[PDB]
Design a protein around this nucleic acid. Structure first.
Ligand SMILES: [K+]
Ligand SMILES: [K+]
Ligand SMILES: [Mg+2]
Ligand SMILES: [Mg+2]
Ligand SMILES: [Mg+2]
Ligand SMILES: [Mg+2]
Ligand SMILES: [Mg+2]
Ligand SMILES: [Mg+2]
Ligand SMILES: [Mg+2]
Ligand SMILES: [Mg+2]
Ligand SMILES: [Mg+2]
Ligand SMILES: [Mg+2]
Ligand SMILES: [Mg+2]
Ligand SMILES: [Mg+2]
Ligand SMILES: [Mg+2]
Ligand SMILES: [Mg+2]
Ligand SMILES: [Mg+2]
Ligand SMILES: [Mg+2]
Ligand SMILES: [Mg+2]
Ligand SMILES: [Mg+2]
Ligand SMILES: [Mg+2]
Ligand SMILES: [Mg+2]
Ligand SMILES: [Mg+2]
Ligand SMILES: [Mg+2]
Ligand SMILES: [Mg+2]
Ligand SMILES: [Mg+2]
Ligand SMILES: [Mg+2]
Ligand SMILES: [Mg+2]
Ligand SMILES: [Mg+2]
Ligand SMILES: [Mg+2]
Ligand SMILES: [Mg+2]
Ligand SMILES: [Mg+2]
Ligand SMILES: [Mg+2]
Ligand SMILES: [Mg+2]
Ligand SMILES: [Mg+2]
Ligand SMILES: [Mg+2]
Ligand SMILES: [Mg+2]
Ligand SMILES: [Mg+2]
Ligand SMILES: [Mg+2]
Ligand SMILES: [Mg+2]
Ligand SMILES: [Mg+2]
Ligand SMILES: [Mg+2]
Ligand SMILES: [Mg+2]
Ligand SMILES: [Mg+2]
Ligand SMILES: [Mg+2]
Ligand SMILES: [Mg+2]
Ligand SMILES: [Mg+2]
Ligand SMILES: [Mg+2]
Ligand SMILES: [Mg+2]
Ligand SMILES: [Mg+2]
Ligand SMILES: [Mg+2]
Ligand SMILES: [Mg+2]
Ligand SMILES: [Mg+2]
Ligand SMILES: [Mg+2]
Ligand SMILES: [Mg+2]
Ligand SMILES: [Mg+2]
Ligand SMILES: [Mg+2]
Ligand SMILES: [Mg+2]
Ligand SMILES: [Mg+2]
Ligand SMILES: [Mg+2]
Ligand SMILES: [Mg+2]
Ligand SMILES: [Mg+2]
Ligand SMILES: [Mg+2]
Ligand SMILES: [Mg+2]
Ligand SMILES: [Mg+2]
Ligand SMILES: [Mg+2]
Ligand SMILES: [Mg+2]
Ligand SMILES: [Mg+2]
Ligand SMILES: [Mg+2]
Ligand SMILES: [Mg+2]
Ligand SMILES: [Mg+2]
Ligand SMILES: [Mg+2]
Ligand SMILES: [Mg+2]
Ligand SMILES: [Mg+2]
Ligand SMILES: [Mg+2]
Ligand SMILES: [Mg+2]
Ligand SMILES: [Mg+2]
Ligand SMILES: [Mg+2]
Ligand SMILES: [Mg+2]
Ligand SMILES: [Mg+2]
Ligand SMILES: [Mg+2]
Ligand SMILES: [Mg+2]
Ligand SMILES: [Mg+2]
Ligand SMILES: [Mg+2]
Ligand SMILES: [Mg+2]
Ligand SMILES: [Mg+2]
Ligand SMILES: [Mg+2]
Ligand SMILES: [Mg+2]
Ligand SMILES: [Mg+2]
Ligand SMILES: [Mg+2]
Ligand SMILES: [Mg+2]
Ligand SMILES: [Mg+2]
Ligand SMILES: [Mg+2]
Ligand SMILES: [Mg+2]
Ligand SMILES: [Mg+2]
Ligand SMILES: [Mg+2]
Ligand SMILES: [Mg+2]
Ligand SMILES: [Mg+2]
Ligand SMILES: [Mg+2]
Ligand SMILES: [Mg+2]
Ligand SMILES: [Mg+2]
Ligand SMILES: [Mg+2]
Ligand SMILES: [Mg+2]
Ligand SMILES: [Mg+2]
Ligand SMILES: [Mg+2]
Ligand SMILES: [Mg+2]
Ligand SMILES: [Mg+2]
Ligand SMILES: [Mg+2]
Ligand SMILES: [Mg+2]
Ligand SMILES: [Mg+2]
Ligand SMILES: [Mg+2]
Ligand SMILES: [Mg+2]
Ligand SMILES: [Mg+2]
Ligand SMILES: [Mg+2]
Ligand SMILES: [Mg+2]
Ligand SMILES: [Mg+2]
Ligand SMILES: [Mg+2]
Ligand SMILES: [Mg+2]
Ligand SMILES: [Mg+2]
Ligand SMILES: [Mg+2]
Ligand SMILES: [Mg+2]
Ligand SMILES: [Mg+2]
Ligand SMILES: [Mg+2]
Ligand SMILES: [Mg+2]
Ligand SMILES: [Mg+2]
Ligand SMILES: [Mg+2]
Ligand SMILES: [Mg+2]
Ligand SMILES: [Mg+2]
Ligand SMILES: [Mg+2]
Ligand SMILES: [Mg+2]
Ligand SMILES: [Mg+2]
Ligand SMILES: [Mg+2]
Ligand SMILES: [Mg+2]
Ligand SMILES: [Mg+2]
Ligand SMILES: [Mg+2]
Ligand SMILES: [Mg+2]
Ligand SMILES: [Mg+2]
Ligand SMILES: [Mg+2]
Ligand SMILES: [Mg+2]
Ligand SMILES: [Mg+2]
Ligand SMILES: [Mg+2]
Ligand SMILES: [Mg+2]
Ligand SMILES: [Mg+2]
Ligand SMILES: [Mg+2]
Ligand SMILES: [Mg+2]
Ligand SMILES: [Mg+2]
Ligand SMILES: [Mg+2]
Ligand SMILES: [Mg+2]
Ligand SMILES: [Mg+2]
Ligand SMILES: [Mg+2]
Ligand SMILES: [Mg+2]
Ligand SMILES: [Mg+2]
Ligand SMILES: [Mg+2]
Ligand SMILES: [Mg+2]
Ligand SMILES: [Mg+2]
Ligand SMILES: [Mg+2]
Ligand SMILES: [Mg+2]
Ligand SMILES: [Mg+2]
Ligand SMILES: [Mg+2]
Ligand SMILES: [Mg+2]
Ligand SMILES: [Mg+2]
Ligand SMILES: [Mg+2]
Ligand SMILES: [Mg+2]
Ligand SMILES: [Mg+2]
Ligand SMILES: [Mg+2]
Ligand SMILES: [Mg+2]
Ligand SMILES: [Mg+2]
Ligand SMILES: [Mg+2]
Ligand SMILES: [Mg+2]
Ligand SMILES: [Mg+2]
Ligand SMILES: [Mg+2]
Ligand SMILES: [Mg+2]
Ligand SMILES: [Mg+2]
Ligand SMILES: [Mg+2]
Ligand SMILES: [Mg+2]
Ligand SMILES: [Mg+2]
Ligand SMILES: [Mg+2]
Ligand SMILES: [Mg+2]
Ligand SMILES: [Mg+2]
Ligand SMILES: [Mg+2]
Ligand SMILES: [Mg+2]
Ligand SMILES: [Mg+2]
Ligand SMILES: [Mg+2]
Ligand SMILES: [Mg+2]
Ligand SMILES: [Mg+2]
Ligand SMILES: [Mg+2]
Ligand SMILES: [Mg+2]
Ligand SMILES: [Mg+2]
Ligand SMILES: [Mg+2]
Ligand SMILES: [Mg+2]
Ligand SMILES: [Mg+2]
Ligand SMILES: [Mg+2]
Ligand SMILES: [Mg+2]
Ligand SMILES: [Mg+2]
Ligand SMILES: [Mg+2]
Ligand SMILES: [Mg+2]
Ligand SMILES: [Mg+2]
Ligand SMILES: [Mg+2]
Ligand SMILES: [Mg+2]
Ligand SMILES: [Mg+2]
Ligand SMILES: [Mg+2]
Ligand SMILES: [Mg+2]
Ligand SMILES: [Mg+2]
Ligand SMILES: [Mg+2]
Ligand SMILES: [Mg+2]
Ligand SMILES: [Mg+2]
Ligand SMILES: [Mg+2]
Ligand SMILES: [Mg+2]
Ligand SMILES: [Mg+2]
Ligand SMILES: [Mg+2]
Ligand SMILES: [Mg+2]
Ligand SMILES: [Mg+2]
Ligand SMILES: [Mg+2]
Ligand SMILES: [Mg+2]
Ligand SMILES: [Mg+2]
Ligand SMILES: [Mg+2]
Ligand SMILES: [Mg+2]
Ligand SMILES: [Mg+2]
Ligand SMILES: [Mg+2]
Ligand SMILES: [Mg+2]
Ligand SMILES: [Mg+2]
Ligand SMILES: [Mg+2]
Ligand SMILES: [Mg+2]
Ligand SMILES: [Mg+2]
Ligand SMILES: [Mg+2]
Ligand SMILES: [Mg+2]
Ligand SMILES: [Mg+2]
Ligand SMILES: [Mg+2]
Ligand SMILES: [Mg+2]
Ligand SMILES: [Mg+2]
Ligand SMILES: [Mg+2]
Ligand SMILES: [Mg+2]
Ligand SMILES: [Mg+2]
Ligand SMILES: [Mg+2]
Ligand SMILES: [Mg+2]
Ligand SMILES: [Mg+2]
Ligand SMILES: [Mg+2]
Ligand SMILES: [Mg+2]
Ligand SMILES: [Mg+2]
Ligand SMILES: [Mg+2]
Ligand SMILES: [Mg+2]
Ligand SMILES: [Mg+2]
Ligand SMILES: [Mg+2]
Ligand SMILES: [Mg+2]
Ligand SMILES: [Mg+2]
Ligand SMILES: [Mg+2]
Ligand SMILES: [Mg+2]
Ligand SMILES: [Mg+2]
Ligand SMILES: [Mg+2]
Ligand SMILES: [Mg+2]
Ligand SMILES: [Mg+2]
Ligand SMILES: [Mg+2]
Ligand SMILES: [Mg+2]
Ligand SMILES: [Mg+2]
Ligand SMILES: [Mg+2]
Ligand SMILES: [Mg+2]
Ligand SMILES: [Mg+2]
Ligand SMILES: [Mg+2]
Ligand SMILES: [Mg+2]
Ligand SMILES: [Mg+2]
Ligand SMILES: [Mg+2]
Ligand SMILES: [Mg+2]
Ligand SMILES: [Mg+2]
Ligand SMILES: [Mg+2]
Ligand SMILES: [Mg+2]
Ligand SMILES: [Mg+2]
Ligand SMILES: [Mg+2]
Ligand SMILES: [Mg+2]
Ligand SMILES: [Mg+2]
Ligand SMILES: [Mg+2]
Ligand SMILES: [Mg+2]
Ligand SMILES: [Mg+2]
Ligand SMILES: [Mg+2]
Ligand SMILES: [Mg+2]
Ligand SMILES: [Mg+2]
Ligand SMILES: [Mg+2]
Ligand SMILES: [Mg+2]
Ligand SMILES: [Mg+2]
Ligand SMILES: [Mg+2]
Ligand SMILES: [Mg+2]
Ligand SMILES: [Mg+2]
Ligand SMILES: [Mg+2]
Ligand SMILES: [Mg+2]
Ligand SMILES: [Mg+2]
Ligand SMILES: [Mg+2]
Ligand SMILES: [Mg+2]
Ligand SMILES: [Mg+2]
Ligand SMILES: [Mg+2]
Ligand SMILES: [Mg+2]
Ligand SMILES: [Mg+2]
Ligand SMILES: [Mg+2]
Ligand SMILES: [Mg+2]
Ligand SMILES: [Mg+2]
Ligand SMILES: [Mg+2]
Ligand SMILES: [Mg+2]
Ligand SMILES: [Mg+2]
Ligand SMILES: [Mg+2]
Ligand SMILES: [Mg+2]
Ligand SMILES: [Mg+2]
Ligand SMILES: [Mg+2]
Ligand SMILES: [Mg+2]
Ligand SMILES: [Mg+2]
Ligand SMILES: [Mg+2]
Ligand SMILES: [Mg+2]
Ligand SMILES: [Mg+2]
Ligand SMILES: [Mg+2]
Lengths: 271, 92, 45
RNA sequence: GCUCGCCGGAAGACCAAGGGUUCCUGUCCAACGUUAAUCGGGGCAGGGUGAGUCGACCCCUAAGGCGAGGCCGAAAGGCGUAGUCGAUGGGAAACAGGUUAAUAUUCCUGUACUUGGUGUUACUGCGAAGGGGGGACGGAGAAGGCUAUGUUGGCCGGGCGACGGUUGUCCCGGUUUAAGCGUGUAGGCUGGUUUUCCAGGCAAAUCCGGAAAAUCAAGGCUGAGGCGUGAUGACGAGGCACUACGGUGCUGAAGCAACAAAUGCCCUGCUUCCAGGAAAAGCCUCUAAGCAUCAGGUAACAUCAAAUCGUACCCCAAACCGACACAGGUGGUCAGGUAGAGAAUACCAAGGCGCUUGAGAGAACUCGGGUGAAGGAACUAGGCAAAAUGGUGCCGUAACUUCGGGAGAAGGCACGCUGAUAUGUAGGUGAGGCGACUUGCUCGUGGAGCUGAAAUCAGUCGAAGAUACCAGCUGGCUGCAACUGUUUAUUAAAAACACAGCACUGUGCAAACACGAAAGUGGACGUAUACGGUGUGACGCCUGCCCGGUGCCGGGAGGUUAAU
RNA sequence: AGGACCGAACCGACUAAUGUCGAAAAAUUAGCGGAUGACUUGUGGCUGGGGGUGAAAGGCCAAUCAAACCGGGAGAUAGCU
């Protein structure tokens, strides 16, 4: 459920929690975990390339399986786990042979359900297939952009691609943006919708909730001096210049798409 | 067992109150050894040159004291001393 | 009330040491200067 | 030497860092010491730092650094792979007592513990650059069991009081003992096995994972503590002994019991919450390449060894950082009594100190305090500054409200001591017993002692009983900012920044964008419920008209239009 | 439970007085704010000068900052004193 917290303190007042009752309460499966040290937004050169990131809670990386390499092998969903490295939840899948892997939990899924993947299989939520084999006009997620790769598109909580059309070797997909992209039919896609759709109704409530998610404070250009940001200076709340990034490029309606290579695949741009 | 070199380890027998008190009561000898000089090399030197039954050798490196001669300051050399314990068959 | 020099021999040598100077093109030139000038304390070490 | 005073969650005791002989003894006061100096952290000699167990080095890693080839870069060199460094983290083992003028978990005595080596011998399959397990982990909270430690009895040795009492419910002092080894408890955690089987853990596996089962219900695991022993010992208050009045060396009494109790220890545990909580070796295990009387494991009596470096002394300071013997700054540990909720505060203990110029006088004036007739903010830019309120329990507490609050609203009253209820009770608490259940650190009766609130009632002293220290001033209207937070180190703490929330906007993943001649990194091991930018700034009610101008976006006919 | 309340340590720096050739190139005394978190702190890293970092003051980058420091061009230049 989406439970609103009672106003016992200012900072608590506005908090809205997404309390999933079906998640596991305990330590995760270690073999799939590994360390994930933080950058703080800095790179090779030790310089802030991405602003406003740094701090937060320490969090380990779960090796989630996007490829779904196991063909013609059934797999029982053992337990749904919380993932700090992701918007969506994950499911500890135990394959019939012996292996265990983490996968993104679709919407219709619980501890006990069985999933199969490969070439044949059945058309059901969670069952990964080649997009050729999937019926046209169906809800998919964890969609590959290249055959044999992991899975790029629709991985966030409540996110899903819809297969619009199927032109021979190619499949026209309508993405969550509204962009209609043409991908290869040999590429795979996990059926259904990505779970944890309540995620968006979470509201943090306090400053520190953003700080313990690893975000840092965003200072407005207008607040700065002219030397710092193009917006800057003025003796008491001035502006009078067109909105811009700290590096002068115009924000607020200014197309930065310039790939050129992959412009053939885009059937129609978003709107 | 390391002939010729053993002779170069032991520099001089140490003289002091602490040196004296550990002769009769504790059955040891305090002595100035080479800056290299391992506990085995001191023991083995005492076992042949002094020719007495060595129980165990303890060692320490004494730091040189910064002296003065009008103007030009000067440090002493970092000599090493070895408390060598002896067995019941003792003498000097 | 807290001054600028807060000593530490590890930091000292890691930063300004002989090997730290030896490491780099420009660091070797510092030594090459102090040797040319003819200093006693070539580096802090 | 004797008083006095001060600190005592330190102004005491240990360290790390940092200093680098400042330590100890003998001597010398020129200079240094804010005065004198016989003294000194000063000068001049000599002495002083003793380790298989403490730390370092060593075996392993994080952040990160370096980086064979490699990719990239006019040169210099940048990035980065297999590796190899890098603790602030992980990995073997020693305590008690005695001792020096100066070191002690290091020397000494009494007891122990670890790992290797090379055997002797009993058996036997071993064996990785490889697999699995372990290491191995967050916040808060709560509860139990303990312990350091205290307090009070008893017990043992001494005391019979300089001024009235004191042979006692009296006084003073003591009542100490470790790691180790044995024991495996308070309690945590987990169904054991036994066999087969299988596209899994790039090979292989008897290990790990999965799947049948059959089959007794427990068997393991971890673990404070206590008890034993260690220890007939060690140690012990005075004595005695000598005196070089320095002490030397000789003896040694009780050496118990309840109660209380940690922020320690079990607990790296349990419950809970989400923001979902390093790594890698040692260690344990399974097999490949191999090896097959072999070498190799195993266990056991040995045996050899456990190298090297630091160890003095200061370490909230006259020894470090501040130019000074500079009221500044500096991480960790130890945490006694009485009052108290307390690591607050007051007075003290251990232990340490009285701050390296003094002696007078007792003007104005300055600084820091105390008291103040009558008035009571009349002061002043402004109640600035002082004065005032203050604790615990109980009764009571308005508009307004986001239904939590405002609120400690407001305002009251009760507080000491002494008897009683009750030769100290509610509780805590637990003994000699007695079942009993078996060999226990037993269950389960049971009420000797210690322990001890909080009340009510009745007295009683003072002017005053939360009597000291300690310890809210309160209420009404209103601007701004929702709020906690951040900010001009060293004249600005705010209405400024941030903020949760809100909108527009870019971004389809070799993402936008950023750092970068580039390779490449970050964004992100993220993928539009995501990410970057911009503005606005919780929440409630809302957010109107203008696209002429500047920008942006789309459109491609026409005009003009570069290189070629 | 809590960017909850009171309040020591710890972190801070609102007011006043003292000091202003200081005890001190920013402190002392008496009150003051936060004090389980957007907290604080030890040890070691990383980011470099038109560059960093900045809950944004032109703050901070070794008592130096609207462009550090050291060496060099260098005896820059000066219709000025
Ligand atoms: K045209
Ligand atoms: K020139
Ligand atoms: Mg791991
Ligand atoms: Mg990263
Ligand atoms: Mg780098
Ligand atoms: Mg670099
Ligand atoms: Mg950016
Ligand atoms: Mg951002
Ligand atoms: Mg994240
Ligand atoms: Mg924002
Ligand atoms: Mg902002
Ligand atoms: Mg903004
Ligand atoms: Mg502003
Ligand atoms: Mg500004
Ligand atoms: Mg900048
Ligand atoms: Mg500009
Ligand atoms: Mg301005
Ligand atoms: Mg201004
Ligand atoms: Mg402005
Ligand atoms: Mg204006
Ligand atoms: Mg205007
Ligand atoms: Mg611009
Ligand atoms: Mg010995
Ligand atoms: Mg010894
Ligand atoms: Mg030594
Ligand atoms: Mg010499
Ligand atoms: Mg200095
Ligand atoms: Mg550094
Ligand atoms: Mg550097
Ligand atoms: Mg280099
Ligand atoms: Mg470099
Ligand atoms: Mg010369
Ligand atoms: Mg020389
Ligand atoms: Mg006192
Ligand atoms: Mg006091
Ligand atoms: Mg104390
Ligand atoms: Mg403390
Ligand atoms: Mg106390
Ligand atoms: Mg001290
Ligand atoms: Mg030291
Ligand atoms: Mg010095
Ligand atoms: Mg000296
Ligand atoms: Mg001396
Ligand atoms: Mg001295
Ligand atoms: Mg003397
Ligand atoms: Mg004299
Ligand atoms: Mg002098
Ligand atoms: Mg003098
Ligand atoms: Mg002076
Ligand atoms: Mg004189
Ligand atoms: Mg002396
Ligand atoms: Mg001296
Ligand atoms: Mg002299
Ligand atoms: Mg030792
Ligand atoms: Mg050693
Ligand atoms: Mg020994
Ligand atoms: Mg050790
Ligand atoms: Mg070594
Ligand atoms: Mg490594
Ligand atoms: Mg790195
Ligand atoms: Mg490199
Ligand atoms: Mg190679
Ligand atoms: Mg190379
Ligand atoms: Mg390449
Ligand atoms: Mg290079
Ligand atoms: Mg080259
Ligand atoms: Mg390089
Ligand atoms: Mg590496
Ligand atoms: Mg290493
Ligand atoms: Mg090292
Ligand atoms: Mg360390
Ligand atoms: Mg360590
Ligand atoms: Mg270690
Ligand atoms: Mg261990
Ligand atoms: Mg070790
Ligand atoms: Mg001493
Ligand atoms: Mg010993
Ligand atoms: Mg003996
Ligand atoms: Mg014995
Ligand atoms: Mg014995
Ligand atoms: Mg032994
Ligand atoms: Mg034994
Ligand atoms: Mg043992
Ligand atoms: Mg052995
Ligand atoms: Mg050998
Ligand atoms: Mg052998
Ligand atoms: Mg052999
Ligand atoms: Mg051999
Ligand atoms: Mg043989
Ligand atoms: Mg034999
Ligand atoms: Mg075997
Ligand atoms: Mg084996
Ligand atoms: Mg292995
Ligand atoms: Mg392993
Ligand atoms: Mg492992
Ligand atoms: Mg750890
Ligand atoms: Mg925890
Ligand atoms: Mg837990
Ligand atoms: Mg915890
Ligand atoms: Mg809790
Ligand atoms: Mg209970
Ligand atoms: Mg209890
Ligand atoms: Mg407790
Ligand atoms: Mg108890
Ligand atoms: Mg006790
Ligand atoms: Mg004890
Ligand atoms: Mg106590
Ligand atoms: Mg005690
Ligand atoms: Mg009592
Ligand atoms: Mg008493
Ligand atoms: Mg008794
Ligand atoms: Mg008697
Ligand atoms: Mg008597
Ligand atoms: Mg009498
Ligand atoms: Mg009397
Ligand atoms: Mg009398
Ligand atoms: Mg009398
Ligand atoms: Mg008494
Ligand atoms: Mg005993
Ligand atoms: Mg004990
Ligand atoms: Mg031990
Ligand atoms: Mg034994
Ligand atoms: Mg047992
Ligand atoms: Mg048992
Ligand atoms: Mg055990
Ligand atoms: Mg039990
Ligand atoms: Mg297999
Ligand atoms: Mg197998
Ligand atoms: Mg086997
Ligand atoms: Mg198996
Ligand atoms: Mg199995
Ligand atoms: Mg025990
Ligand atoms: Mg006993
Ligand atoms: Mg005993
Ligand atoms: Mg006995
Ligand atoms: Mg005896
Ligand atoms: Mg004695
Ligand atoms: Mg007597
Ligand atoms: Mg005797
Ligand atoms: Mg005796
Ligand atoms: Mg006796
Ligand atoms: Mg007697
Ligand atoms: Mg006796
Ligand atoms: Mg006792
Ligand atoms: Mg007892
Ligand atoms: Mg009693
Ligand atoms: Mg007891
Ligand atoms: Mg108790
Ligand atoms: Mg306590
Ligand atoms: Mg605590
Ligand atoms: Mg503690
Ligand atoms: Mg604990
Ligand atoms: Mg391992
Ligand atoms: Mg074995
Ligand atoms: Mg053999
Ligand atoms: Mg083995
Ligand atoms: Mg044995
Ligand atoms: Mg033996
Ligand atoms: Mg031996
Ligand atoms: Mg010491
Ligand atoms: Mg001391
Ligand atoms: Mg201090
Ligand atoms: Mg301290
Ligand atoms: Mg102190
Ligand atoms: Mg001082
Ligand atoms: Mg100064
Ligand atoms: Mg001075
Ligand atoms: Mg002084
Ligand atoms: Mg000083
Ligand atoms: Mg001072
Ligand atoms: Mg430290
Ligand atoms: Mg009492
Ligand atoms: Mg008390
Ligand atoms: Mg009180
Ligand atoms: Mg105090
Ligand atoms: Mg007392
Ligand atoms: Mg005392
Ligand atoms: Mg004194
Ligand atoms: Mg005095
Ligand atoms: Mg004195
Ligand atoms: Mg006169
Ligand atoms: Mg006067
Ligand atoms: Mg006066
Ligand atoms: Mg005054
Ligand atoms: Mg006055
Ligand atoms: Mg006054
Ligand atoms: Mg007064
Ligand atoms: Mg007054
Ligand atoms: Mg008055
Ligand atoms: Mg008056
Ligand atoms: Mg009157
Ligand atoms: Mg009056
Ligand atoms: Mg009045
Ligand atoms: Mg007036
Ligand atoms: Mg007036
Ligand atoms: Mg006025
Ligand atoms: Mg005031
Ligand atoms: Mg007052
Ligand atoms: Mg009062
Ligand atoms: Mg009310
Ligand atoms: Mg009213
Ligand atoms: Mg209320
Ligand atoms: Mg109000
Ligand atoms: Mg109150
Ligand atoms: Mg009240
Ligand atoms: Mg009241
Ligand atoms: Mg009010
Ligand atoms: Mg009131
Ligand atoms: Mg009273
Ligand atoms: Mg009774
Ligand atoms: Mg009574
Ligand atoms: Mg009683
Ligand atoms: Mg009573
Ligand atoms: Mg009774
Ligand atoms: Mg009772
Ligand atoms: Mg009980
Ligand atoms: Mg009982
Ligand atoms: Mg009990
Ligand atoms: Mg009893
Ligand atoms: Mg009993
Ligand atoms: Mg009984
Ligand atoms: Mg009994
Ligand atoms: Mg019985
Ligand atoms: Mg019992
Ligand atoms: Mg019993
Ligand atoms: Mg029972
Ligand atoms: Mg019972
Ligand atoms: Mg009962
Ligand atoms: Mg009773
Ligand atoms: Mg009593
Ligand atoms: Mg009455
Ligand atoms: Mg009367
Ligand atoms: Mg009266
Ligand atoms: Mg009276
Ligand atoms: Mg009163
Ligand atoms: Mg009072
Ligand atoms: Mg009063
Ligand atoms: Mg109060
Ligand atoms: Mg009123
Ligand atoms: Mg009103
Ligand atoms: Mg108004
Ligand atoms: Mg109003
Ligand atoms: Mg107004
Ligand atoms: Mg208004
Ligand atoms: Mg307003
Ligand atoms: Mg505010
Ligand atoms: Mg500040
Ligand atoms: Mg300021
Ligand atoms: Mg300023
Ligand atoms: Mg403020
Ligand atoms: Mg201010
Ligand atoms: Mg706000
Ligand atoms: Mg909304
Ligand atoms: Mg718009
Ligand atoms: Mg959008
Ligand atoms: Mg560039
Ligand atoms: Mg380049
Ligand atoms: Mg690139
Ligand atoms: Mg990247
Ligand atoms: Mg990463
Ligand atoms: Mg703002
Ligand atoms: Mg608004
Ligand atoms: Mg604003
Ligand atoms: Mg409302
Ligand atoms: Mg309109
Ligand atoms: Mg228009
Ligand atoms: Mg028009
Ligand atoms: Mg266009
Ligand atoms: Mg256009
Ligand atoms: Mg167009
Ligand atoms: Mg066109
Ligand atoms: Mg055209
Ligand atoms: Mg033309
Ligand atoms: Mg809390
Ligand atoms: Mg709070
Ligand atoms: Mg608070
Ligand atoms: Mg205090
Ligand atoms: Mg403080
Ligand atoms: Mg501090
Ligand atoms: Mg502070
Ligand atoms: Mg401060
Ligand atoms: Mg201050
Ligand atoms: Mg004021
Ligand atoms: Mg002020
Ligand atoms: Mg003012
Ligand atoms: Mg004042
Ligand atoms: Mg002055
Ligand atoms: Mg203050
Ligand atoms: Mg207060
Ligand atoms: Mg305060
Ligand atoms: Mg507050
Ligand atoms: Mg507070
Ligand atoms: Mg936090
Ligand atoms: Mg450290
Ligand atoms: Mg640092
Ligand atoms: Mg930098
Ligand atoms: Mg510059
Ligand atoms: Mg430059
Ligand atoms: Mg420039
Ligand atoms: Mg900031
Ligand atoms: Mg300005
Ligand atoms: Mg700042
Ligand atoms: Mg410039
Ligand atoms: Mg310069
Ligand atoms: Mg010139
Ligand atoms: Mg000019």
């Amino acid at each position: 459920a989406v439970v609103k917290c009672k106003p016992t303190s200012p900072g608590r007042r506005h908090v809205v929690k997404v309390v999933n009752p079906e998640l596991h309460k305990g330590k995760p499966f270690a073999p799939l975990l590994e360390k994930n040290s933080k950058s703080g937004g800095r790179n090779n050169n030790g310089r802030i390339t991405t602003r406003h990131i740094g701090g937060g809670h320490k969090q380990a990386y779960r090796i989630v399986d996007f490829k779904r390499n196991k063909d013609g092998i059934p797999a029982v969903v053992e337990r749904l786990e919380y993932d700090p490295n992701r918007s969506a939840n994950i499911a500890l899948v135990l394959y019939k042979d012996g292996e265990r892997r983490y996968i993104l939990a679709p919407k219709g899924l619980k501890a006990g359900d069985q999933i199969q993947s490969g070439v044949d299989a059945a058309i059901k939520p969670g069952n990964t297939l080649p997009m050729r084999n999937i019926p046209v006009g169906s809800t998919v997620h964890n969609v590959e952009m290249k055959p044999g790769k992991g899975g790029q598109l629709a991985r966030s909580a409540g996110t899903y691609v819809q297969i619009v059309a199927r032109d021979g070797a190619y499949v026209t997909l309508r993405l969550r943006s509204g962009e209609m992209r043409k991908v290869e039919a040999d590429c795979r896609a996990t059926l259904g919708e990505v779970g944890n759709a309540e995620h968006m109704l979470r509201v943090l409530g306090k400053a520190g909730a953003a700080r313990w998610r690893g975000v840092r404070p965003t200072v407005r250009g207008t607040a700065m001096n002219p030397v710092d940001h193009p917006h800057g200076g003025g003796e008491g709340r001035n502006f009078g210049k067109h909105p811009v990034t700290p590096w002068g490029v115009q924000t607020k309606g200014k197309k930065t798409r310039s790939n050129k290579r992959t412009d053939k695949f885009i059937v129609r741009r978003r709107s | 067992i390391r002939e010729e070199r053993l002779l170069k380890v032991l520099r001089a027998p140490h003289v002091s109150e602490k040196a004296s008190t550990a002769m009769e009561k504790s059955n040891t000898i305090v002595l100035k050894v080479a800056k290299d000089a391992t506990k085995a090399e001191i023991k083995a030197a005492v076992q042949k040159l002094f020719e007495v039954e060595v129980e165990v050798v303890n060692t320490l490196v004494v730091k040189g004291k910064v002296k003065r001669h009008g103007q030009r300051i000067g440090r002493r050399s970092d000599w090493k001393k070895a408390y060598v314990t002896l067995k019941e068959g003792q003498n000097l | 009330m807290k001054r600028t020099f807060q000593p530490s021999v590890l930091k000292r040598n890691r930063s300004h040491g002989f090997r730290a100077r030896m490491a780099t093109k420009n660091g070797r030139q510092v030594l090459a200067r102090r040797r040319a000038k003819g200093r006693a304390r070539l580096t802090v070490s």
